[PDB]
Amino acid sequence: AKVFQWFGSNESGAEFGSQNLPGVEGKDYIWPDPNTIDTLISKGMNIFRVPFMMERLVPNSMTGSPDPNYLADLIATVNAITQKGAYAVVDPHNYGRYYNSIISSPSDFQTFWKTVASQFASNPLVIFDTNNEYHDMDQTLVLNLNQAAIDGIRSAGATSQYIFVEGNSWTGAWTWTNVNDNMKSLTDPSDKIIYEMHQFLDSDGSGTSATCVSSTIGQERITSATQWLRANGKKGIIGEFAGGANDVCETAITGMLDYMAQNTDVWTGAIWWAAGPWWGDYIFSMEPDNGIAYQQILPILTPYL
Numbered sequence: 001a002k003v004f005q006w007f008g009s010n011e012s013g014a015e016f017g018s019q020n021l022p023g024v025e026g027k028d029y030i031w032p033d034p035n036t037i038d039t040l041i042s043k044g045m046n047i048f049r050v051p052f053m054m055e056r057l058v059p060n061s062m063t064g065s066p067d068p069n070y071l072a073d074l075i076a077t078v079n080a081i082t083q084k085g086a087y088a089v090v091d092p093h094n095y096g097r098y099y100n101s102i103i104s105s106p107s108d109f110q111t112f113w114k115t116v117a118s119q120f121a122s123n124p125l126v127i128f129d130t131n132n133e134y135h136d137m138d139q140t141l142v143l144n145l146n147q148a149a150i151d152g153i154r155s156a157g158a159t160s161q162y163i164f165v166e167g168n169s170w171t172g173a174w175t176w177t178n179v180n181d182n183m184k185s186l187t188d189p190s191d192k193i194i195y196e197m198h199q200f201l202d203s204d205g206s207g208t209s210a211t212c213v214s215s216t217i218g219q220e221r222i223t224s225a226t227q228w229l230r231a232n233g234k235k236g237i238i239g240e241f242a243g244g245a246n247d248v249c250e251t252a253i254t255g256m257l258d259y260m261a262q263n264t265d266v267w268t269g270a271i272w273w274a275a276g277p278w279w280g281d282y283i284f285s286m287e288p289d290n291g292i293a294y295q296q297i298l299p300i301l302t303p304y305l
């Protein structure tokens with residue numbers, strides 16, 4: 001049936017308006033629509049990544065208590081995804097930073113992660129994602145933060161769940177081998193680490209242009225990462241990727257996914273960026289029924305579902 005272990009979409013919105021903390025639900029940010037998630041599940045997607053802000057979930061100090069109202073909506077979003085059998089990725093979309101400062105204390109980060117994991121420890125369809133897109137920060141620190149997250153998660157008794165770890169350089173697949181080699185050393189008593197890498201297809205890899213470099217750029221940019229995963233005995237996932245609704249990008253997307261389908265010994269699947277209810281005319285919107293990617297990219301993703 002399905003080609004990959006996991007194939008689905010980011011469900012963005014709870015991390016919107018990040019300049020406004022705590023911000024106001026329904027004004028600065030919004031949670032995903034369970035009904036449009038239901039539509040994507042019906043099409044065959046089985047994984048939904050849910051960005052949220054660390055500061056909204058655990059304000060002021062990451063070692064403190066959660067904010068009950070924001071936590072309630074995270075739980076509602078997650079448990080609805082998982083009630084249907086799909087996996088829900090809990091993603092503190094924080095770039096290795098808390099109140100815009102590098103998270104320099106692995107012990108504080110471990111406590112944050114025990115707190116979060118304790119809210120989901122009996123749900124085997126939750127996936128914990130240590131942090132979205134570490135960047136511009138010490139490389140040993142990135143390793144140590146990922147390890148601290150794992151340690152906190154497992155200390156909470158959340159042992160059935162996969163943990164998505166992310167590297168430096170915005171966890172890019174194309175820069176993985178030269179930047180993130182030290183990530184090979186991460187340890188997990190559950191043996192459920194997945195190396196989450198992101199790959200955009202525009203000139204600079206920022207995912208801000210709908211134009212892709214070429215019809216083969218996706219395969220090109222993930223090839224070395226694929227060899228690093230295999231040689232190091234690791235498993236990976238593409239946790240964010242996108243291209244514009246045009247021929248070159250559509251061919252790049254197909255070529256990337258086809259290459260990944262030939263390498264499922266290491267690639268567990270792929271997650272599109274992004275669906276969510278506040279994208280409007282976003283160049284990559286996967287939100288049913290009118291997102292441009294839902295209209296023009298989903299027909300090329302269904303062959304893998």
Ligand SMILES: O=[N+]([O-])c1ccc(O[C@@H]2O[C@H](CO)[C@@H](O)[C@H](O)[C@H]2O)c(Cl)c1
Pocket residue numbers: 133169170172175198200204205206207
């Ligand atoms: O590796 N690079 O040469 C490179 C990586 C990332 C870049 O831009 C960032 O891309 C992120 C997504 O891949 C995005 O979230 C972030 O906002 C961008 O700054 C560049 Cl330009 C280059």
